[PDB]
Design an enzyme around this catalytic site. Structure first.
Site, PDB file in Angstrom:
ATOM      1  N   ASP B  25       0.822  -1.209   0.000  1.00 39.26           N
ATOM      2  CA  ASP B  25       0.000   0.000   0.000  1.00 39.26           C
ATOM      3  C   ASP B  25       0.857   1.260   0.000  1.00 39.26           C
ATOM      4  O   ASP B  25       1.305   1.722   1.053  1.00 39.26           O
ATOM      5  CB  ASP B  25      -0.926  -0.031   1.219  1.00 39.26           C
ATOM      6  CG  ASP B  25      -1.978   1.062   1.196  1.00 39.26           C
ATOM      7  OD1 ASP B  25      -1.786   2.074   0.499  1.00 39.26           O
ATOM      8  OD2 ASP B  25      -2.998   0.907   1.896  1.00 39.26           O
ATOM      9  N   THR B  26       1.075   1.829  -1.184  1.00 35.92           N
ATOM     10  CA  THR B  26       1.950   2.993  -1.282  1.00 35.92           C
ATOM     11  C   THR B  26       1.313   4.240  -0.686  1.00 35.92           C
ATOM     12  O   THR B  26       2.003   5.226  -0.439  1.00 35.92           O
ATOM     13  CB  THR B  26       2.355   3.291  -2.734  1.00 35.92           C
ATOM     14  OG1 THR B  26       1.184   3.510  -3.527  1.00 35.92           O
ATOM     15  CG2 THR B  26       3.160   2.137  -3.325  1.00 35.92           C
ATOM     16  N   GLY B  27       0.001   4.199  -0.456  1.00 38.38           N
ATOM     17  CA  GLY B  27      -0.685   5.311   0.167  1.00 38.38           C
ATOM     18  C   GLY B  27      -0.636   5.295   1.684  1.00 38.38           C
ATOM     19  O   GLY B  27      -1.074   6.255   2.319  1.00 38.38           O
TER      20      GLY B  27
END
Ligand code: NI7
Ligand code: CL
Ligand code: CL
Ligand code: CL
Lengths: 99, 99
Positions: B25-27
């Protein structure tokens, strides 16, 4: 480009003729933008967040530029903490994760 | 590997002697895992997003193996609906976004 993750992967997007900051978010199925005016009819959509579910407005076939890459697709509008570019549009612009 | 984003980027992780499925999850700034035992001291933290906040326990210096790559960092434990690998650990395995 290649974007590392030491900082938040914030990029500039263009939507409705305006520049905005947005987060490239592989953990988001969908793209969600802060309150703004978009054309056409909308449909209801539920997002499941870490802290619970929330209802937003779904607009389809919206023109949007992400880091200069042109996309056309579904954009949700609602009370997101930050503008989020999710997998629906990340796939359109050919974005992958690599390690 | 190279991971496309047509579907959720789920991988197997090893943590605390257990195997779990988790989302790259890059967010997410932080890594958050469903309830499990971890060694050492912890302190409470609140983490949140579009659907609200949850209370979690913060454990530091936790070793994880993500899709075959070892790393160490802070792991939050709490009532997350999905196990999340956030940027704090994504950097350590050399994960980047590319388009
Ligand atoms: O709801 C959240 C959320 O709370 N977070 C924040 C988060 C979650 C876990 C750890 C951390 O440090 C931060 C976001 C982050 N990416 C998508 C995480 N989401 C899910 C989401 C968001 C927008 C559109 C979607 O289709 C899905
Ligand atoms: Cl779309
Ligand atoms: Cl860390
Ligand atoms: Cl690096």
């Amino acid at each position: 480009p290649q974007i590392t993750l030491w900082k938040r992967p914030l990029v500039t997007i263009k939507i409705g003729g305006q520049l905005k900051e947005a987060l490239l978010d592989t953990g988001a199925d969908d793209t969600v933008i802060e309150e703004m005016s978009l054309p056409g009819r909308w449909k209801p959509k539920m997002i499941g967040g870490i802290g619970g579910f929330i209802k937003v407005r779904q607009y389809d076939q919206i023109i949007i530029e992400i880091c200069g890459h042109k996309a056309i697709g579904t954009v949700l509008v609602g009370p997101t903490p930050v503008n989020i570019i999710g997998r629906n549009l990340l796939t359109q612009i050919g974005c992958t994760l690599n390690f």
